[PDB]
């Protein structure tokens, strides 16, 4: 079982609606555990998971300080970016930051990242070697220069290869019952006669974790041409997903649904009957 920790940062200028918005969320695997909302009341980092709640005031004070520093940096960046692209301070703009790390099944460092975006487009990102940068355009070239001269890379690499990984592991034990769990999908099939010539077969997967899963439709034991809905959150820490096929009436038994998830000892095969 592989694992990961991610932080997603959103910075939004809003001319005529007050000061810039800043939001940070933290994930371990497919579970979120922390948040910060500059519009919220506490002005602190907040627990968004029961298992993180048992962290002491030392932890929360520290995280609050950092996220505030993060916020300030993005506040400055918003204006800087306006300058690089020659934009008036009337338009609304968004900055996005994402960093975190990956561990293999052995819980050892696999890979780390630091991706940065401006108005939904790539801006600058840390290469896999965690030693060099990729600038999306000429503007990001100037940032690339800055960051090289300031040795930002080695700073991040230290975090990504170490602290990030060590804390991912710590979280994994602290949230054993939650994070180190697999919830096998509950399945069932529903037949719905849409037209007189065609009916829809929908294959359901519910209450599964983690989110990874694959649903396939086969006719006579052969893969199919099919509506596959984006995996959605149930709101209780599990995920849902369904796959549907439009089949001619009477030929229902020709079709079989195939569900695979790491919570299952082996794949499931569902037929309408």
């Amino acid at each position: 079982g592989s694992h990961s920790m991610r932080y997603f940062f959103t910075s939004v200028s809003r001319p005529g609606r007050g000061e810039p918005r800043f939001i940070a969320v933290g994930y371990v695997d497919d579970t979120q555990f922390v948040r910060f909302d500059s519009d919220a009341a506490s002005q602190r980092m907040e627990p968004r998971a029961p298992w993180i709640e048992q962290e002491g005031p030392e932890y929360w004070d520290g995280e609050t300080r950092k996220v505030k520093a993060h916020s300030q940096t993005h506040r400055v960046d918003l204006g800087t970016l306006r300058g690089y692209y020659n934009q008036s301070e009337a338009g609304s703009h968004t900055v996005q930051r994402m960093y975190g790390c990956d561990v293999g099944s052995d819980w050892r460092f696999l890979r780390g990242y630091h991706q940065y975006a401006y108005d939904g487009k790539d801006y600058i990102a840390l290469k896999e070697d965690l030693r060099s940068w990729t600038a999306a355009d000429m503007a990001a070239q100037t940032t690339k220069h800055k960051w090289e001269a300031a040795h930002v890379a080695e700073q991040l690499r230290a975090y990504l290869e170490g602290t990030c990984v060590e804390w991912l592991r710590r979280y994994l034990e602290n949230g054993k019952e939650t994070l180190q769990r697999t919830d096998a999908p509950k399945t069932h099939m529903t037949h719905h006669a849409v037209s007189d010539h065609e009916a829809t077969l929908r294959c359901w997967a519910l209450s599964f974790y983690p989110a990874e899963i694959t649903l396939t439709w086969q006719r006579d034991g052969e893969d199919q041409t099919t509506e596959l809905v984006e995996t959605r959150p149930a709101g209780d820490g599990t995920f849902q997903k369904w796959a549907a096929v439009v089949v001619p009436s009477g030929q229902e038994q020709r079709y079989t649904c195939h569900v695979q998830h790491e919570g299952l000892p082996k794949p499931l095969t569902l037929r309408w009957e």
């Binding site: 520093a69 993060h70 940096t73 400055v76 940065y116 960051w147 930002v152 975090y159 602290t163």
Partner: peptide, 10 residues
């Protein structure tokens, strides 16, 4: 935990 160091501006 978030990164500890101060983040360079763009």
């Amino acid at each position: 935990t978030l990164a500890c160091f101060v983040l360079a501006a763009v």
